[PDB]
Every structure is written in C-alpha cells, then in structure tokens.
Design a binder for this molecule. Structure first.
Ligand SMILES: O=c1ccn([C@@H]2O[C@H](COP(=O)(O)OP(=O)(O)OP(=O)(O)O)[C@@H](O)[C@H]2O)c(=O)[nH]1
Ligand SMILES: O=c1ccn([C@@H]2O[C@H](COP(=O)(O)OP(=O)(O)OP(=O)(O)O)[C@@H](O)[C@H]2O)c(=O)[nH]1
Ligand SMILES: O=c1ccn([C@@H]2O[C@H](COP(=O)(O)OP(=O)(O)OP(=O)(O)O)[C@@H](O)[C@H]2O)c(=O)[nH]1
Ligand SMILES: O=c1ccn([C@@H]2O[C@H](COP(=O)(O)OP(=O)(O)OP(=O)(O)O)[C@@H](O)[C@H]2O)c(=O)[nH]1
Ligand SMILES: O=c1ccn([C@@H]2O[C@H](COP(=O)(O)OP(=O)(O)O)[C@@H](O)[C@H]2O)c(=O)[nH]1
Ligand SMILES: O=c1ccn([C@@H]2O[C@H](COP(=O)(O)OP(=O)(O)O)[C@@H](O)[C@H]2O)c(=O)[nH]1
Ligand SMILES: O=c1ccn([C@@H]2O[C@H](COP(=O)(O)OP(=O)(O)O)[C@@H](O)[C@H]2O)c(=O)[nH]1
Ligand SMILES: O=c1ccn([C@@H]2O[C@H](COP(=O)(O)OP(=O)(O)O)[C@@H](O)[C@H]2O)c(=O)[nH]1
Lengths: 228, 230, 222, 216, 227, 226
C-alpha cells in the first residue's frame, strides 16, 4: 500500500484562494498539509500553477499577444513558488525551488537529476515557471515532471472532494479512457494525454480538508483514482 | 528649454489601476502617452514598479521573510514590464526590455551600454526587476538608472498634477530647490531615491501622466507640474 | 505566400533512411534552404534525430526512457551542427539555439533573439527539441512555430504530400485518419490554427515554390 | 595490483564494427566493468565516439564544429554505458567537459575523485571540452588529474608482454595517439593495452596478472 | 551574546595596507584572523572594498566619468577578492567568491541562496564587485549583503580601535545617537540602510591579533551600534 | 610607409608611469596622441597590460596560484582599458572595449569579425584580458585576427640595441632577432609574428608625437620584418 514518491499540482486557487493575488490563510493551510505528509517519509515534488495572477489565453482574448502573456503567467507561478517556500519554511520543511526559466539569483535552474536527489535527501522540490514554454499549461508540466522524476502518481489538489458526473454521484475509481468516454474534467486534455499514453495515474482529491493528502499517500480510498 | 534623454518612473498604480492586478485601460493609456513622446524625438527609458502585485515591506509585516517577499515584488515588476511592452507594441513602438535579475529567455540582462544604445537607435528601454536586490525600491532604481544612462531628468509620473503644500481639500508648487523639498517635508520620492538624485544633482519632475498630452509637454520644456532642481 | 516559415527536418533528411549522416542528403537540404533565403523568406528550422536514437525504440530495447530521450535530443544537435556547416558553405548565415543549454556548442534558447535573427535575414536552427523527455520533434516544431510567430509549419518529407490530397481541413484529417505528424503536435496545431504543409523537399526548388504560395503538396488549414 | 584506473573506450566499444550503437557489445562491456568495481578498484571511464562517423573529413566540415559533434556523440555513448551499468547494479556519475547541467554534472576533477572514493563509477563524456583534442589525450589527461595508477587502453584485439615509454618510440608501434602518449611518458603514467572483450580479462588486469601489453 | 553569522567589511586599507596596490603582510594577517574564527564555528561572509586602487568619486574629480570610474573601482575589489581567497586557501579555508558583475570563469555570479548554503557548509563567501551598480559604496554593499544573507551584525573592520568622540572611545551607541552626535561609523546611505532595518554595526580594530574572534564571542570591544 | 591598420601594444606599467596605480597625466596624453592618428585616418586597435597594479614581481613571489594570479592581471588590463576609453572619449573618439572573458555589464565580448567592423566605422577598439599567456602574445594574436598591418610595441626605450648593458638598430629581420638574441617581445609572441610575417615596430612612447610617426611611416625605432 502507499505511494513513495508523488507529484502534487497546486492550482492558483491554492494561492489566491479564489480571487486574484495571494491569500495567506490558504497557503498556510496548504503548507501545514504538505508538511504533515513529508514527516511520514513521502518524497514530494510540487508543481505550482498561476491562475491567481494571469493566464495566457485569458489575456490573449483581450488583445495581448499570447507568447508575452504566457511568460507573464509563468512568472506569476514563480511568485507562488517563493510564497510556498516561505510558508513551508515556517512549518520546518526544507525546500528546493527549481524554475524552468533559468533565474540563477532566484532559484536553481531545471536540473532533473538533482531534483531527484533533493527528494531522496528529504527535501521538498518546487517546480516553478511551469515547463518554461509558451502554449503549455502547468497541468501538463505536472504530467511531464512527474514522469521524468519517476513519481508514482500525480496528485491533482482541488478544493472539492473529487470528480463527479456533472455539476451528482462522485465516482471513486475510473479508467483513464473511462474519463474521456464520460467527458470528465480531470486535467488538461494535453496533460491527460501525456499521463494516459504513459500509464501515469492521477488522484483528484480535496487537499484542504484536514489530513487528506496524508490519507492519500498511505493508500486510503480517498478522492478519485484514474488508473489504467 | 527641452530634455533630450529622460527616465520615466511608472509606479504600480499605472498597471493595476489602483487595484491589485492588471487594468488594461491604464497601461493602454500610458502606452499611448509614451508613444506620443517617442515620435517627438525623446530618448526614453522606463523603470517599472510593482505595487499592484506585492510590496516586500507589507508582506514582511504579514510574517513573510523580507528577502523572499522582495523577490516576489521584483518578479511582479517584469510582469508589468512585459505588459507595457505589449501595449507599447500595439502603438507601433520598438521596445527592448532588460531585467536586473538575469532571465535570458524572457529579456536581455541589464547591460547599461546597450541600453543607451538602444535609445540612440530609437527604441524604448524598459527596466524590469528593479535593481535586482532586496531592500531597495523602484524609486531608488529610477534614481540610479537615470544616473547610469545619463538621463537629463527623472520623470516621476503620478496620477495627480504634482506636489502640493498640504495634501488635499489647494496650493500647487511649480519650482523647488532640492533642499526646499527637505526643509519642508514634501514627498517627491523615497528618502533614498531623492538623496541619490540630490547628492548627484539629478532633477526630478513630478507630474500627472494620465492627462492626455502632458508627458510630451513636460519634455518639450513646458513649465508643467513640479520641477525640483539644483 | 509565406513571410516567416518553420521547416521541420526529420532524421530522414540527414541519415537518409539509414543511420548516421549521408552528406549528399544534408547538402541538398542546405541547397534548398539557401534558395528560399535568397527569396526573402524568414526560415527557422527544427531538427529531428531519428538517424541516431529514438527514445521510445531504445526504451523497448531495454533502456530507461528518460536517459534515452536525452540521447535522442543530443542526436539532434549533431544533426543541427551538420546543417549549420553546409548552409554556411552555401553562403548562408546560421545561428543555432539549443533547448538544452550548452553555452560553448551553441547559444541557449532565447526566443526574442531567434526572431531578431530572422528579421536580420539569418537562419535559426532549433536543436535539442524542446529539451524535455517524453516529447517529439513534431511537437517541438509546433511549439517553436507558434512562439516565433511563423505563418505555417513546413513538414518536410521525401514523399510529395499525404494520400494525393492537395488541401484538407484540420478536422478532416482527424476524421479520415490520415497521417501528417505526431498526434500531440497536430492537436497543438489544430487547437491554435497553425497551418501545416507536407511536401517533398528532395525535389529541386519545391520548398522555394511552397513559400511562394504555389499549390504544392498537402496543405492542412482551418 | 592497481587501486585507481582510467579506462579508455573507443567508438568500437559502442557500435562494434559498424555505425551507431550495438546493445550486445555495450552490455558485455559493462558486465566486465561491473565485476571490476566489485573487486575493489576505483574505475573512471573516458568515452570515445567513433561510432557516429565513417567521410567525416571528406565532407569538409570544419574541425571546430566537427570536433564538437564527436564530443556530443561521446555523451550519447556515456548515457548508454551508464544505463547498461545501472542494470548491472552499479552506481555511476556522468561528467561532461562541456557544461550541460540538465544532462549531466560538469567536469570537476576533485568531485570525480570524491565519487570514486564513494564507490561510484565516473563516466567522462565530451572528451576534453575543446576542439583539436582526441580521446586518447583526454584519457591521458584525466588519468593524471584524478590520480589513476594506469591507463587501460581497451582494444578488441588480444607478442610484447611489457615495453616501456622510452622503449616503444624506437619502433613503429602506435599504442595511442602521439600527443596522448607524450603526456604519459612525460608524467610517468603506465599504459596497458588489452582485450576488454575476452570474458573477465580486465579483472585479471587490475589484479596485476600478465595480460596484454604494459608500457612503463 | 555571541554572533552566529556575521558580515565583515574589509576596506582597501586592508589590502593596500595604506599605500596603493597590495601588501601581502596585511592581507596575510587578515586571513589569519578570519581563519581562526571560521574554526570557531562562525559563518562569515566578507565584502571587499577597493580604495587601494580606484574610488569613483575621486577619479570623477580628475575629469573622468563617474559611471566608468565606479566600474574601474569595482574591478579593483575583485582583484582584492582573489588575493583574500588565495591567502585564506593557504590557511586551508574553503572559500567561494561571488562577484556582482558576472564574469563566469573568474568567479561565480551573485547567487544569494547559495551563499548562505556555503556558509552552512562552513565556507567563507567573498562578495566581490560591490553591488554591481555605479553610484554605490561597498559600505552600502555590506549593509545590503548582510540583510539578504541573514547576518546577525555588520563588522566594520577598521585599523583603529573603534569610533571615537573626536582620547574618548565609545563602547556602545544607539543608531539614532550616531546621527545626533555626528559620529562617523560607515556611509550615510549605508547607515540608513542599517538603521532602518535594525542591523547592528560593530566597528573594531581588526589588525590587533585575536580581536575578531573576540568580537564574535560577544565581548565588548570596539564600538557597537544598536537599537 | 603608410600603415592603414595598426595594433598598438602598451605595457601596463606605462599608465602607472612613475609608480604603482594610474597616472592620469600620462594616459591623457596617450589618448590625445591616439586621437591625432584616427582623425588622421588610421584604424587603430589597442592591447594594454597590467604591470602597474602590482609591484614588479609582486605575485610572482607572493605564492599565488598562477591561474588565479593571471586572472588578477587580466582584471587590471580591463581597469587600464576603461581608463583609456574615458580619456579617448573626452578626446572625441568613439571607442569599443572588447574583453577576452565575457563581462557583459562592463564591456563587450571578444568577436574579431565585429572588431574590424568597429575600426571600419572610425572607432578604436580596445582589447583587454587574453591564463598562462602574456599580453605580448595577445597583441600578436589580435593583430593577426584583425588584419593589422603591423604590431607597434610602445616601450620606454628608443628601440632595440645591438648589445645591452651601444647603438640602437633601426631595421632587423625576423630570423635575425632569434639569432642575435635580441629583446623584442615575449618568445611566443615573437614566434607568432615571425611564423606569420607580421611586422613589429618597437619605439619609445614616452616622447610625444611618436605614435604618429610610427603610423605615418617615418623611419623611427626598430622595424622587425621578414
Ligand atoms: O539574452 C537575451 C538577449 C536579448 N533578448 C532579446 O532579444 C531581442 C533582440 O536582441 P538582439 O541582441 O538579438 O539584437 P538587438 O535588436 O537588440 O540590437 P542590434 O541588433 O541592433 O545590435 C531583444 O528584445 C532582447 O531584449 C533576450 O530575450 N535574451
Ligand atoms: O554584451 C554586451 C555587448 C555590447 N556592449 C556594449 O554596448 C554598446 C553598444 O552595443 P551594440 O552591440 O548593440 O552596438 P555597437 O555600438 O557595438 O555597434 P552597431 O550595432 O551600432 O553597429 C557598445 O559600447 C558595446 O561595447 C556591452 O556592454 N555588453
Ligand atoms: O549541474 C549538475 C550537477 C549534478 N548533476 C547530476 O545530479 C546527480 C546528483 O546530484 P548531486 O550533485 O546533488 O549529488 P551526488 O550524489 O552526485 O553527490 P553527493 O550527494 O554525495 O554529494 C548526479 O547524477 C549528477 O551527475 C546534474 O545533472 N547537473
Ligand atoms: O544557480 C543556482 C543554484 C542554486 N541556488 C540555490 O542555492 C541553494 C543552495 O543549493 P546548492 O546547490 O548550493 O547545495 P544544496 O542545497 O543542494 O546541498 P547539497 O546538494 O550539496 O547537499 C539552493 O536552495 C538553490 O536553490 C540558486 O539560487 N541558484
Ligand atoms: O508551461 C507553461 C506553464 C504556464 N504557462 C502560462 O502560465 C499560466 C499559469 O497558469 P496555469 O494555466 O498554469 O494553471 P492554473 O493556475 O490554473 O493551475 C498558464 O495558464 C499559461 O498562461 C505557460 O504558458 N506555460
Ligand atoms: O531593486 C529593487 C527594486 C524593487 N524591489 C522590490 O520591489 C517591490 C515593490 O516595488 P515598488 O515598491 O517600487 O513599487 P511601486 O510602488 O513603485 O509601484 C518591493 O517590495 C521590493 O522588494 C526590490 O526589492 N529591489
Ligand atoms: O523535445 C524533444 C525532442 C526529442 N526528444 C527525443 O529525441 C527523439 C527525436 O525523435 P524525433 O521523433 O524527434 O525524430 P524524427 O524521427 O522526426 O527525425 C525523440 O524520439 C525523443 O527520443 C525528446 O524526448 N524531446
Ligand atoms: O557597489 C559598488 C561598489 C563599489 N563601487 C565603486 O568602487 C569603489 C570602491 O570604494 P569602496 O569604498 O568600496 O572601497 P573602500 O573605500 O571601502 O576601501 C567605490 O568608490 C565606487 O567607485 C561602486 O560604484 N559600486
């Protein structure tokens, strides 16, 4: 039972708390939760999203170029990354932040072999700037990094308990292909492909209800498990 | 009578519109008013603030560490820089962005000799990431950059007409000495920004940027706003 | 006709159906890229690397895929430096950016600079794919095309088009099941409406005729 | 016997006779490294890349750019070795003379020694980091910088059982590239030419047994 | 009492020994003194001044451009930084030099997260090139580098015992009181940066053998500025 | 003669001129002599040493690691280079500082194809830096790479004497210096020129108006040519 190495995707919702900017009362709750599961010995890499600031396709619909707006939005997710790092630090947790856009003064660059040893060294690894590339999502970054750093599962942390059938019975266990056949919102379509095609399982759970991610990695039947 | 090269300081309210985030109505209007001055033949670099995302000092008081919160603030500065770049592109203006924190993929690093040479080429240089270091401000950034690139004056763009003896609810000042600002307690900039310009004789001009046509006035030498000098 | 183009070169176009480098192939490629820079087209090109290793074929031989994807990606810099040399001997100015930073071998990926190079009449070569495992070169050419703001993706093959449909909608190739490029890359093209033109490069003057706007190959367009 | 060894592997040791990569050859090359590691000797490996060429110097490429492609090819050989070692249960550390970060650790010699002392096998890819250098010279140089006891020139061929640096130069015997050989003869490194591919012959070699040809 | 992580300002006086250029006797003495406090267990980062070569404002007075002169003067600090690295290495002390103006192969760029990690590994971080920007001092660079790397105090290493009142050496002043008495501690702008963030400043005679380990243990030597 | 593009080599100890450090009174006149040349119409590239920021055999004896000791010298050349850039600009001369080690913020990297592009545009280019080589050698190599017609070794003696402690010789051949044992430049520097035909002109720099006579093709100093 259990997952030894996980990749946790935090949306911008987990930083802004719904609205724009930063909600310290959420990042605190967010950090107390990660810390509870690191003390259990799980190696946990965190991929940071950035919708509490900008989203590239949102700003392009307004008139801004998309490329320039995708960089704008990856830069927001570094700001979340520095903020998760501070709150995890007040929790006693050692952090290592890695950005896909290299910014030496601010974080070490993307080096996957070192990111894997940080974990083994018991450090929490924070991937910022997503994948570094415009026309991609942080959902897809979580799929990508999770496959490269040898994660056992991608933990899609949400503010509701799992995947329902419309917005309504919540279903606990589904095939990857079962999700697409029932037209379900599990992640990016692009992200889901990279996972399904490579057999990477995904767990959609309510990270904010107390002590749920620790339940998750112990193997308990928590949330929704997408597995092939 | 006339400034040849200028350094304009845009606070975060020129991107957030008073509020946290990005109000595209304001950058569009600021981008419109910069293009008007570029076609007039002024060389203009732009130091960009980030009040509309994070200030390190206020997050420090919420409990966050100052240095991490200051980096968050400088990262927000490049987000405003890229946004000014976009709107300034839609006005048909050629821009080079430079980040004090080095980010090859996003913008060329801070190289000051190339900066003044883009200006000579007719381009607008946008100075992102502040000074690249915590425990500083973009007001002080403007003071330093203006000095390093040989700007004739620091343009402190505000949304009011200038400095007034006493807040609001009426008496505006046209021309002040540097020591006049100090002896009277007027707020023109950071204590450090101002000291950096006063000690090196850089003039500061505080003016209402948002009234259509006014920056282009200020640069042609018009007696607009508030000029602190000598 | 097209102002900025992103041409995708597979390991076919360096190794030639065998393994390694067949310099008669590479030289003809350079010969044809040469033709279009004289034409006034801004061309950036993405280099694939199946004449050495493919990450998913080595993964089936036994090897770990991550480690093998990097092997594949270095393969493309070898192909990338090869094109550089021959295009130079055709008299063309090149500049090679790698998605995996190597400093001394080539400049890193600076996309705003890749585009000032095009504007200056130079040919930008995009090596090391996207610099990430679990991706293909076809996906790279879509991403790189949208980022440098190219008008169309030239999918260079050695057959002339796909089968010979001369113009097809983005949704019509999903509905008939024709093959144009990787499914991950095509969907990133369809979803952003980036056109893809599949054409025989190896016939003389074909690509020069493609950027000219001529009915050539198979054009996928919504 | 020998305590620390530098092993030079030609392109031949990766593609076999022909071009590209041969899993059989690489697998038996690693099987041989493994029972050596297990034997207690610290072993660092310099990797060549002749399996990615033929015609190279008949196309006219430059040598600067040419030499860099070869150097890139050695890093593909290193990653490949590292994989087949890993399946044999051997911990490795690939270093490159050309900084790459994302692919591999840079070349620091102090930190390579650290790795050997910690029981890991160091693979040196990208050669010397510069054009106009061979691999025989990278081997001669890195054997020196990490303090190896001997350079092991792994050939595919099996008779002189001992010559010396001052003895060979009188005969038409090429044991390695003349720039590499002139570095070893000048600094007192021995050179052992042997058949790596006869089963368990490198284990006998570092034990001190009469194998192949030793140059002192 | 004692300081657990410290930042040490060495002016040009501490390499040129007074005259211009470099004086190995002075530098050796300075490395001896740093080395024996690193074994004490102190994490120590050093900011290197440059008056034994160039000072921006002084070349400015001779006609030269300030901006260019400031850069001249910054490269002077790297020259000193390499000397201090050298003498400390010959004392068997692991050093790491980070330079504000990045040169790559001469030293590593400014990476502050990694500077505190060097200190935690027991290494001596040397801060060359000041802050990298014209129109600043290395006194301000120490005040800045000390706040960001988290140091407990700034050690203004002088050749005199401490801050005087023109005899009369002062053992402990408050920040506000230095400005009110017009005492000369550091820079004007360097002191403000310190005063405004509550960063203490100990001014002491580094040259008298054993004074810095003395200072670090928390003994009352020199002049301590605190609020 | 009539030299159209020249590589001027100055020993660093010239700028410190009398002591250690920098004597602005000397680099000032060096700048204004170089201006007369370019406003005359000659293209001029400059290499400067570092010997003024050290006391003679300072770090030869100090025990310093030679790689680190060399980097200290390269930094001093750049300090010397910026100081020249400044007075040459007050002389009204566009200048460009190129550094062998990339120092983006301080100057521009070394690209020789761009370096002649500067001289063609009436600008002076200044070469800093160059481990384990002397600035004599770098002057030899820059001069070759930028197509210079001649390497002007500006030294503090009138030329090359036959005996040394005589008569200063005015014209020698490349094979003649190696054979007679004459002090022209570093051995590696000299072999770089003699193996590539590159002529070398040794002349005293402290006497004013001499740089101008070198380029003009006055028969001054010692001309070494094969
Ligand atoms: O490291 C870098 C350097 C530059 N850039 C960005 O690339 C763009 C082109 O920068 P370039 O250096 O390629 O040319 P230039 O237009 O700036 O100047 P000149 O050719 O006239 O000499 C500029 O917008 C720059 O900000 C990066 O994104 N990263
Ligand atoms: O990386 C660099 C490159 C260049 N520079 C410095 O910036 C200044 C101008 O930078 P540029 O390279 O863009 O123009 P240029 O004067 O050299 O020549 P043209 O393109 O107009 O033909 C030059 O003085 C150069 O030394 C840097 O400081 N850092
Ligand atoms: O820049 C780098 C440095 C290191 N690495 C790679 O990261 C992996 C481990 O990275 P580390 O350097 O952090 O740990 P280590 O196991 O190799 O050494 P110690 O903990 O004992 O001190 C190694 O396989 C290395 O090659 C990179 O990929 N890039
Ligand atoms: O380029 C860089 C490299 C590193 N760092 C940051 O410096 C800090 C020090 O990270 P280090 O690489 O210096 O050592 P470490 O913490 O990983 O400890 P060991 O593996 O050796 O056991 C890290 O937190 C990193 O994010 C940067 O800011 N920029
Ligand atoms: O590889 C990446 C990662 C992020 N982004 C941009 O940065 C934004 C960050 O938001 P994100 O979409 O990642 O996710 P969310 O915050 O909703 O989880 C994206 O939306 C894109 O606009 C991008 O362009 N490429
Ligand atoms: O050199 C600099 C420039 C800016 N900042 C950061 O910039 C943030 C906000 O900028 P600023 O206060 O200037 O914004 P404005 O109010 O002018 O919009 C602060 O919290 C600082 O951390 C910094 O730390 N160093
Ligand atoms: O972003 C990239 C680009 C390439 N590759 C690897 O490099 C190989 C290059 O193969 P590709 O399909 O691109 O080459 P082609 O057949 O088009 O020549 C891929 O298969 C992967 O193994 C990768 O992992 N990521
Ligand atoms: O951030 C910095 C650091 C140094 N300097 C320049 O380098 C000189 C070094 O002076 P410093 O006071 O630091 O040396 P000290 O006097 O302390 O010996 C300064 O005067 C400036 O000319 C600078 O401009 N910015």
């Amino acid at each position: 039972s259990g997952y030894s190495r996980v990749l946790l995707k935090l949306g911008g919702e987990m930083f802004g708390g719904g609205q724009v900017g930063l909600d310290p009362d959420v990042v605190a709750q967010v950090a107390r939760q990660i810390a509870d599961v690191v003390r259990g010995g799980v190696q946990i890499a965190v991929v940071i999203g950035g919708g509490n600031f900008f989203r590239g396709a949102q700003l392009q619909q307004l008139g801004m170029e998309r490329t320039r707006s995708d960089y704008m939005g990856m830069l927001g997710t570094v700001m979340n990354s520095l903020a998760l790092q501070d709150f995890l630090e007040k929790e006693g947790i050692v952090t290592r932040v890695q950005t896909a856009i290299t910014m030496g003064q601010v974080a070490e660059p993307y080096l996957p072999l070192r990111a894997v040893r940080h974990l083994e060294k018991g450090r929490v690894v924070i991937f910022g700037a997503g994948m570094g590339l415009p026309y991609f999502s942080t959902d897809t970054t979580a799929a990508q990094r999770a496959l490269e750093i040898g994660a056992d599962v991608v933990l899609m942390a949400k503010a509701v308990d799992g995947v329902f059938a419309e917005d309504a019975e919540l279903l606990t266990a589904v095939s990857h292909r079962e999700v697409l056949d029932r037209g379900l919102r599990v992640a990016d379509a692009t992200a889901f492909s990279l996972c399904m095609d490579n057999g990477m399982p995904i767990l959609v759970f309510n990270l904010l209800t107390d002590g749920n991610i620790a339940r998750a990695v112990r193997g308990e039947k928590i949330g929704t498990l997408v597995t092939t």
